[PDB]
């Protein structure tokens, strides 16, 4: 008949399976267009995008659920907490990069596509690439926290939940 689930890349002895969750064209395109999988571009810009998303998303919970949520100063306090969390995350990223990558070693990323075509391995899995990524992450996260604060409590836009 017609079966949907197939072995990964046609190899039945690799510990994975091809399912609509993992191999559908829409999800494949979406994952390929995320900054974490853009192999052929400077990791600094990708880290900028990642930090801009994450620091922006982190503002809400700190501002609204925090201890000073009912104070008139709740927005600034929550934004400061989100910035501190971004700083801690950047520290963790730097620690991982220092522990994982030596300066002279080449990339640990795969050099083959699913079709067996040779490609340039991702420079994100090198010391310099990871350093650029975490610097971009810090710069983007601080900017995203500041932008969320500016949109919520400097222009005071009529957001339903603030």
């Amino acid at each position: 008949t017609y079966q949907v689930i197939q072995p990964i890349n046609g190899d039945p002895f690799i510990g994975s399976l091809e399912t609509p969750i993992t191999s559908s064209p829409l999800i494949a395109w979406y994952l390929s267009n995320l900054p974490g999988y853009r192999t052929a571009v400077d990791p600094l810009l990708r880290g900028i995008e990642v930090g801009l998303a994450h620091g922006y998303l982190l503002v809400g919970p700190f501002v609204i659920t925090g201890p000073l949520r009912n104070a008139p100063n709740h927005g600034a306090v929550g934004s400061l907490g989100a910035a501190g969390l971004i700083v801690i995350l950047s520290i963790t990223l730097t620690m991982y990069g220092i522990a994982s990558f030596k300066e002279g070693d080449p990339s640990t990323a795969p050099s083959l596509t699913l079709t067996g075509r040779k490609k340039v391995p991702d420079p994100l899995q090198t010391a310099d690439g990871w350093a650029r990524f975490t610097g971009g992450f810090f710069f983007g996260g601080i900017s995203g926290v500041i932008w969320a604060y500016f949109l919520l409590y400097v222009l005071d836009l009529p957001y339903f939940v603030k």
Binding site: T1, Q3, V4, I5, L17, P67
Partner: protein, 742 residues
Amino acid sequence: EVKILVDKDPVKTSFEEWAKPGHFSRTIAKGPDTTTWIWNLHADAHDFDSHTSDLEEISRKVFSAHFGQLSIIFLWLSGMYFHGARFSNYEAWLSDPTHIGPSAQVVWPIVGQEILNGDVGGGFRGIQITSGFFQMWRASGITSELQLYCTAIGALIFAALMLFAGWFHYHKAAPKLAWFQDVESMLNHHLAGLLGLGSLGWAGHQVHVSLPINQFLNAGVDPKEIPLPHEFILNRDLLSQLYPSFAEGATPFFTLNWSKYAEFLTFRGGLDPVTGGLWLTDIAHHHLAIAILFLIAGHMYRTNWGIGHGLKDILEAHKGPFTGQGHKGLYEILTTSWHAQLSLNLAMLGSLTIVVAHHMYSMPPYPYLATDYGTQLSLFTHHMWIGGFLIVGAAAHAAIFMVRDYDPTTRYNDLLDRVLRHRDAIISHLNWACIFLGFHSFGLYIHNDTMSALGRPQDMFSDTAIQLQPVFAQWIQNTHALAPGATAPSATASTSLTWGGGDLVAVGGKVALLPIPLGTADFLVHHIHAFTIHVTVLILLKGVLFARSSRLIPDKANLGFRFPCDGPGRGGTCQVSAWDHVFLGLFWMYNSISVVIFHFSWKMQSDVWGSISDQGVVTHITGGNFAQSSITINGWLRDFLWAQASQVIQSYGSSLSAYGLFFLGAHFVWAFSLMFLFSGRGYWQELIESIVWAHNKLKVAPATQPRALSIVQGRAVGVTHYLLGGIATTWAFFLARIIAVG
């Protein structure tokens, strides 16, 4: 063709194998060399598929064992009816069920134990019973002690019948394997014959013996002047006065005028205000409809004539793009493996028992059961425990089937194969779900405890603080409360008083049931329940799925289903068998059921049960303290464990003194289990080596060499004692509290 197939005189009846212990197995029959033998005899007593490889021989054994079990159950029922007839205050309780506590056990006057015969009322001294037999007997129409004696005699006769049937069907007429594998005939007979005809007969009894006698009882006439049940069959005139429709006979039934029977066949809902239970006219109609439904259901499968279904035909036609061949091959598995059928039936029965427990408290079927709090709590807890144990046994026997009877070369099934090909994804996802639920359920309690301890009540998760409202359950309650008007127009009231219809039923100055409110605390306990259920499911499913092999042990099937380990290699391989997984999952089942019964007890004592005065004011047992106190662990420790244990700890010198003694004994046994759970047999064998020297010095060393318990046996002893002590602690505490204050 479906026909009776038997073998004559397969096994000779003799006492020769009684004198040879361990005759059933090759290894044990040779006699003991060490003490381990003595245990091995009892662990392998009922492992029939290990005694012989013949499917027919095994099937005959289980068929006779079922008859033995039925005989034991009939003996137990006969004893219950005899004690009701001979050592009970049932006849006094009938005339005053609101002020007299049921009692059917009286102790002898020895060593001062006669203090347990307490004042249960009605000029009677005894032990108060919580089985609910009195209310069932009243519902059945039983009025005198003589009818209980006859029931005891009949149950004794039936027990003798089942014992003789077991002997006859193992030793004289043993059915063949083809007879057992006639699954279509068995399903047809169990659906139409057993269930349908049984419910039809019970409906007949209810419309002929139960309805009139209970109408007389609820009218306030003396039990000793109610006409006897047969008098309602002899002169139909007596039956044409309570219900004039009986004057028409069976003509309305055959002419399809069924509304003429609306007097005793109703669709009411709610509870009987005089009784506090479901209307008997509702129950009779329920059983009459169930009889027709099951009689029609029992005609689905093909046995000997063309009409009907083939189970294999239905199974082989259900397949899709995601499941390959589908259910093809399942008929062969379920007709050749006793363990798979046992697993499925155990899971279904354990799930059904929990549903029974949930439905019996919200819709009390028996008269004067709702206002007897001790009976309600006991029945709920008992059925919850039974369901949990059966559910765990389901996983155990599924693992046994996987270890022994699984064979892809001869009994392949696509669904089971595909499940085994992605077990890592299933187990990892269940692991993540368990961690997420544990955090977002229990850590909220820790957050509340820390906020309360820090002097910040406004930062907690509570109804006067950050709210977590169960809006979906509230919507379901509101929908069920509006059913009689829009979605069940023929029904007069909702199926339960707890949905929210804004009414309360009071019997004898006591609250039967009322709308149960749901808030933040309920939101917390429900997710706590879900977390524990998910963890138990994870433990059992991981054992079932990884029983044959794993990345650590590629050949785990050759080690058997019940083995201790595979050595200290690979870092340590302790408790890798499927048996250990059941051993671990028993603890989590115990934890989950304990939390469920604690939730039930506190909620019922705080928001439902209580007293009502002749002013219209309700006062609950603990005064609605669940909403604000059950949101912290300290609340459970203080307002539930500490506050409600004050009964069992001050029961000395009263009729409830046996519950404090059992309280202490259960604590002792629970502590005793930790010796077995925390240690290992290597220390104990070495310790025994020194005692054996002392015995040899005095020439008193036994020939049966003393051995420390096996690695698996120690785990079994530890878990058995743990469960016994834990369950008995709650048994004693609950019974003392609900008898003293209820």
